[PDB]
């Protein structure tokens, strides 16, 4: 997907301030809390019985760190997301059979987490640029369904 220079500026400036050890776990945890059917794919993570159990689950935090790494890898390759995500697409599509609507949901949860952390700094034009990013990642992750 194509971001304008102003969009790339808004995205990269915010992302350099992201805590990459935490924000991924926050987004994955909120996905499991807000859209509970996604817990189907994480039975091995243990205690997911309450929001507090999910958010403080160390496996959720560690796996969320991997997820955010992939978003970061996408940000470095905005003009070529399909090649970047080919391996993750085969995993999530061919092996896991995650419905691709959930890629969109997780991207939107991450947007909510960025809005929570950054407040007024997460302006509507900054959000619009991030929506293009998370849509491009979700489409790339779904490419093996297409």
């Amino acid at each position: 997907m194509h971001l304008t220079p102003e969009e790339k500026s808004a995205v990269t400036a915010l992302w350099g301030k992201v805590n990459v050890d935490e924000v991924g776990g926050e987004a994955l945890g909120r996905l499991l809390v807000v859209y509970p059917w996604t817990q189907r794919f994480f039975e091995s993570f243990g205690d997911l019985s309450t929001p507090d159990a999910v958010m403080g689950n160390p496996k959720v935090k560690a796996h969320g760190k991997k997820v955010l790494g992939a978003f970061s890898d996408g940000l470095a390759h905005l003009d070529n997301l399909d090649g970047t995500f080919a391996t993750l697409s085969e995993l999530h599509c061919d092996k896991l059979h995650v419905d691709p609507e959930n890629f969109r949901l997780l991207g939107n949860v991450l947007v909510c987490v960025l809005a929570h952390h950054f407040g007024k700094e997460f302006t509507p034009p900054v959000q619009a640029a991030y929506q293009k990013v998370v849509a491009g990642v979700a489409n790339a992750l779904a490419h093996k369904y297409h």
Partner: protein, 142 residues
Amino acid sequence: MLSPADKTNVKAAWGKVGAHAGEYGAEALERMFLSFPTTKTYFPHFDLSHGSAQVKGHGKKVADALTNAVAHVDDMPNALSALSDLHAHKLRVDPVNFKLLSHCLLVTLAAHLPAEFTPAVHASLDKFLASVSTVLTSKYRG
């Protein structure tokens, strides 16, 4: 199902929104128009630029409708009946667009209520806006 705890969470978050409700509704509309530009085609007679008095005035209407839903949370189909007729029969709003505005409302709340937007409250608000959206699209195929 809006649980008792959901209703408590939603009332409390809306209570903290306070008299910013209308400003927040306007911000959510602006986020939707910039993030999901397909939605702008429903408002050709609106100027949708930043600071537009029409978007500000409409955001207040949106917020008042949401506040009516909060105040009648156990009876939202009846509370929102006239609004669901408008959006389905007259405006022909695509159901997919209610998910878009709901997300932008969540983003707006998260950007303004850092203490209140816990995961539990995020979930509750999400269910509330999905329930509102279900009523507002119910005159299509519900």
